Amino acid sequence: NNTIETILAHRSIRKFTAVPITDEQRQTIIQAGLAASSSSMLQVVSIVRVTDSEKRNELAQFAGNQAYVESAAEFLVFCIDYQRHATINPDVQADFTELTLIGAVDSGIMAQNCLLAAESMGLGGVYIGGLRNSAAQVDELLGLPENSAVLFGMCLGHPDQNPEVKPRLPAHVVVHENQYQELNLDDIQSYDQTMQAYYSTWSQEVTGKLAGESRPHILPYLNSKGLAKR
Amino acid sequence: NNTIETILAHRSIRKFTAVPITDEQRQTIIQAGLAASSSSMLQVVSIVRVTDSEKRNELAQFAGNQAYVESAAEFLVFCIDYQRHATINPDVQADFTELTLIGAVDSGIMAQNCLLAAESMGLGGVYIGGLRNSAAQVDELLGLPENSAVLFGMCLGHPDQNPEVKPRLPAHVVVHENQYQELNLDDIQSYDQTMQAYYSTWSQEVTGKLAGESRPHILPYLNSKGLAKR
Numbered sequence: 397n398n399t400i401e402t403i404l405a406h407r408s409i410r411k412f413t414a415v416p417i418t419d420e421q422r423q424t425i426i427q428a429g430l431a432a433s434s435s436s437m438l439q440v441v442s443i444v445r446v447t448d449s450e451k452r453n454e455l456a457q458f459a460g461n462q463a464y465v466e467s468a469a470e471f472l473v474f475c476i477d478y479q480r481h482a483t484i485n486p487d488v489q490a491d492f493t494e495l496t497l498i499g500a501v502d503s504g505i506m507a508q509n510c511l512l513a514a515e516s517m518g519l520g521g522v523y524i525g526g527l528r529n530s531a532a533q534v535d536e537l538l539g540l541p542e543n544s545a546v547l548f549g550m551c552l553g554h555p556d557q558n559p560e561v562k563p564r565l566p567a568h569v570v571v572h573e574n575q576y577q578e579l580n581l582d583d584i585q586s587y588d589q590t591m592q593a594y595y596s597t598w599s600q601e602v603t604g605k606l607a608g609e610s611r612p613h614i615l616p617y618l619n620s621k622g623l624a625k626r
Numbered sequence: 627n628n629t630i631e632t633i634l635a636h637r638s639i640r641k642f643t644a645v646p647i648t649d650e651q652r653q654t655i656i657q658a659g660l661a662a663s664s665s666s667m668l669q670v671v672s673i674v675r676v677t678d679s680e681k682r683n684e685l686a687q688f689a690g691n692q693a694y695v696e697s698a699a700e701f702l703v704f705c706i707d708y709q710r711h712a713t714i715n716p717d718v719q720a721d722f723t724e725l726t727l728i729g730a731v732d733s734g735i736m737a738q739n740c741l742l743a744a745e746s747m748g749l750g751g752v753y754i755g756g757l758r759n760s761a762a763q764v765d766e767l768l769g770l771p772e773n774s775a776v777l778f779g780m781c782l783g784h785p786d787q788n789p790e791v792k793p794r795l796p797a798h799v800v801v802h803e804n805q806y807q808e809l810n811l812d813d814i815q816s817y818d819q820t821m822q823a824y825y826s827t828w829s830q831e832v833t834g835k836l837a838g839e840s841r842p843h844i845l846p847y848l849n850s851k852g853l854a855k856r
């Protein structure tokens with residue numbers, strides 16, 4: 397069917413033309429996102445649509461000079477939001493890590509619906525997690541209140557590049573039957589050879605990134621917004 | 627188009643027939659999940675397929691006595707997995723909170739592709755966050771190693787019910803233009819009235835749950851697995 401063909405044809409697009417996304421298409425992308433499942437129907441996700449060209453230039457820099465944040469037809473920022481709940485009832489305890497986990501999982505579900513809706517219309521896109529490296533600055537720029545935090549952005553627009561589909565680890569590595577199965581390093585070596593053909597190896601690149609520190613300012617940032625304190 | 631029609635037609639299915647999901651259908655649902663975007667191509671999601679009927683009964687009780695976990699044709703468990711990376715290179719530091727946020731976001735994105743693929747074939751499903759009620763006991767049952775943690779499960783199967791689509795908060799409440807906008811409590815009242823017509827109000831029910839403690843055992847659980855320590 398068309399749904400599965402769309403899911404399997406995905407590739408991140410990082411070059412866009414200047415053709416805008418119509419109001420009808422944008423309203424449909426947001427509705428597709430809203431139709432996503434929500435943990436306990438809590439509805440903990442907020443989207444900040446950035447149209448101001450000066451804020452977009454600042455966001456591209458805050459993302460690590462990723463130019464497509466400025467050139468994209470639409471830039472959406474996904475945020476955890478327990479301020480809606482806190483405004484309704486001030487007795488809400490939003491600082492439990494469980495709530496940040498729900499915020500992250502639900503944001504991913506919603507965002508994927510938005511991206512899939514866009515891709516089905518012939519649009520292209522890419523998630524922007526780079527915003528987290530300058531989290532406090534992005535948070536202030538968007539005026540996010542207490543009980544709210546930035547997670548990632550999303551570029552949407554008409555493609556001006558056609559990259560090849562990137563291979564993933566095989567299903568027998570990622571999927572386990574009944575109990576977790578120990579890793580066979582021969583599968584990692586085969587995947588590394590598959591990635592070298594597409595393009596330092598994959599395993600050497602990813603484990604080398606994790607051998608150092610991974611954005612150490614993230615927990616103090618979440619805590620400063622009143623999230624994940626216990 | 628068909629992808630958008632499938633996305634908007636979603637409703638959680640909690641009643642299934644005894645008809646199984648074929649091998650061709652299951653392999654497609656997994657391949658759809660793998661086609662999802664991955665933060666820094668880290669591929670930190672592991673899926674545990676539970677076919678053992680004795681384990682299913684235990685998971686149903688651990689999930690807060692949710693019978694559909696036992697009667698579903700397929701029950702997939704989504705987990706954060708940095709053990710594959712640690713097996714390749716022991717020097718990997720997997721304890722930074724940033725890495726748990728990547729794990730949670732990436733799992734949500736992957737899981738949604740799996741559900742959408744299933745829903746497009748005429749199947750139904752529901753996410754099961756209830757596994758977190760007894761996270762440490764669910765972890766021991768599935769044999770998850772260090773640097774790995776359970777997030778949620780997913781029931782999949784042929785529907786034996788036809789629920790009406792549940793309305794969400796309007797687009798103007800969830801989407802903010804350029805800067806975060808303050809909440810107009812009239813919109814929450816309008817929404818509560820829309821939810822009363824569908825069926826204490828939505829706003830009072832969700833904020834009442836958040837006024838209590840939300841799974842306080844979660845951070846210690848992640849910490850016990852070597853995750854979210856700093």
Ligand SMILES: Cc1cc2nc3c(=O)[nH]c(=O)nc-3n(C[C@@H](O)[C@H](O)[C@H](O)COP(=O)(O)O)c2cc1C
Pocket residue numbers: 432433434435436437501502505636637638639640692752753754755756757778792
């Ligand atoms: C990660 C996550 C966890 C969920 N866990 C449960 C669960 O344990 N039990 C259940 O019956 N529903 C669960 N749901 C499903 C719903 O509560 C649901 O999405 C919702 O109330 C909105 O209804 P709909 O999906 O039918 O539109 C979960 C949803 C998400 C996104």
Ligand SMILES: Cc1cc2nc3c(=O)[nH]c(=O)nc-3n(C[C@H](O)[C@H](O)[C@H](O)COP(=O)(O)O)c2cc1C
Pocket residue numbers: 406407408409410462522523524525526527548561562661662663664665666667731732735
């Ligand atoms: C939450 C998340 C954040 C991401 N952040 C970035 C980013 O900041 N910039 C970028 O160029 N791509 C980013 N990506 C996209 C990928 O690097 C990408 O999904 C990947 O390498 C696999 O390639 P494909 O999506 O083309 O299949 C992100 C993906 C996810 C899931």
